[PDB]
From Swiss-Prot, chains A, B:
The keyword Signal does not apply. Pfam families: KwaB. The gene is kwaB. It comes from Escherichia coli O55:H7 (strain RM12579 / EPEC). GO terms for biological process: defense response to virus. This is Kiwa protein KwaB. Keywords: Antiviral defense.
Length: 313, 313
């Protein structure tokens, strides 16, 4: 389901906006309905609709690649292509379909410390888009305290620091039965997705040691505890057009002949394995199995692709 | 000044943290000093240090490219390489150097509607890093409203709507005499940099007209009122490895041979100029002069680089 089709689904919901209702997900994994005032609700609706337009509708550089094809692209919504739905995904699926007559409402004596996330149900064209935000530390919003009598020298101090936020920023959303991610840190941390990524990264590490391309993998095994390397290891494990496709000797000779790659990735003292241990050399070898080292067919200049897309498909 | 040098400067300030003091910049372009309570000041220091570490120190994939070399890369702090300092740049430069004994303090009767931005002066290793935050449009809170006496009759509703925010999110910062941008929308909008960008885009249009490579520029001028195309026109005007090379016939033949481009970028009946009228053809020609169409010398697959880095340095 292409990016343009995502745009037309979003515009069908937006331009036929039917209603908005907000679901709080608690720490006990029960969807408690909210009690947002009508005027604030209209303001919320307006702001979030504008945010959706700015990020999807009028966003011409909006790209929809796979989450397992993780790269560094701003204004990019990743398609969730994994088999494992963290419990909040199922909670959002059920959040789509609380019947309107339900009295399962959120008691506000909970002081908004039970609030674990916030679900914004924007409905349109008889469909229901669902946004998810989290309950961050309340940015520490300090207001001037003018205790005095009722203070031109007062000082700034957060008073309640229990007030709900929703700074108009979806971390992820779901249309139909298709989930999209904007703030990946939320998925890997709050929803505890790092397990899946680290397991796929271990699969990649095993394929690398079994491929016998490098000499000492303890460098990569050390770097695999960080998630910034685990995502790239998972990307290589699931999408590498180099690992498992081109033979090892061709890769060794490619590094040898490639002037820059040889100077960036040092070659082994023998010549059948590679010596890749330091953080930068690890990152370069990672970008090597990612096929990010590309030469121009016009200007004949080599580049370093942070984000790329196949054109033949 | 490379990215690693930024990393060691930032860790020098962080690991030798000496103090933090906050300056409010008003709408009249005068730096009024703040009155943040000590504990809240401590929370600010803590949170902003964590954000700085997460975005610079512990960010292993942090890139520091030029602002005029704008591409779509997350975890990237753009180096301000223009000659024109928007007024807030000078305001931050002067914010670095308010003497500690200054009593030019912000009177809080202003209800924080005079607050135009917020300057966070994080000092360390006898240097002063300076963060800048603004009041983003898409920002809102909600507190519970309910009372009766002091009965489930009440709703959630924002009431003060004057409270200062300072989400732990810097839009840009300045170390020494080197400015870096994170939230580019803040620069192009609040600081009104879009004039400079549109001027560079008109310069690019003129350079394209002088190149005599295209036939009709009316499409480009229509799309140039949008800023998302103006940034790409500025990138081509200052960095294009294709524009500025007088070889239109070579580019024509390249497009002809290029399997993908030939279907999108049509050649005229005389074969000396290009036919670029539709938005899609415009976007493809833009990514063409950006040298984003790159073929692998290993997998022999053509790709579309959203973000790239020249490797020669």
């Amino acid at each position: 389901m292409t990016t343009q089709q995502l745009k037309e689904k979003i515009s069908k919901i937006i331009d036929n906006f039917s209603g908005i209702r907000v679901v709080f997900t608690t720490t006990a994994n029960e969807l408690k309905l909210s009690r947002i005032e009508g005027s604030a609700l209209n303001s919320i609706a307006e702001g979030f609709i504008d945010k959706i337009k700015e990020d999807i509708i009028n966003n011409e550089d909006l790209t929809s690649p796979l989450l397992s094809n993780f790269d560094d692209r701003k204004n990019a919504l990743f398609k969730f292509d994994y088999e494992q739905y963290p419990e909040e995904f199922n909670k959002i699926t059920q959040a789509i379909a609380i019947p309107p007559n339900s009295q399962d409402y959120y008691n506000p004596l909970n002081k908004f410390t039970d609030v674990k996330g916030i679900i914004i149900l924007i409905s349109g064209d008889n469909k229901c888009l669902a946004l998810y935000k989290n309950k961050t530390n309340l940015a520490v919003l300090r207001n001037s305290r003018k205790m005095f009598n009722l203070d031109p020298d007062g000082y700034l101090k957060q008073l309640p620091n229990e007030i709900l936020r929703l700074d108009f920023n979806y971390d992820l959303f779901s249309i139909g039965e298709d989930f999209y991610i904007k703030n990946h840190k939320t998925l890997e941390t709050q929803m505890k997705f790092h397990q899946v990524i680290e397991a796929q990264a271990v699969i990649a590490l095993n394929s690398l040691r079994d491929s016998l391309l490098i000499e000492d993998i303890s460098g990569l095994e050390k770097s695999s505890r960080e998630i910034s390397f685990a995502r790239k290891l998972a990307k290589i494990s699931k999408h590498s057009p180099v690992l498992g496709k081109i033979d090892t000797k061709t890769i060794i000779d490619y590094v040898s002949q490639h002037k820059y790659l040889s100077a960036i990735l040092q070659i082994n003292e023998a010549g059948d394995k590679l010596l890749i241990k330091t953080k930068t050399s690890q990152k370069h070898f990672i970008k090597l199995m990612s096929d990010d080292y590309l030469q121009s067919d016009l200007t004949k200049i080599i580049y370093m692709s942070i984000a790329k897309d196949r054109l033949d498909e």
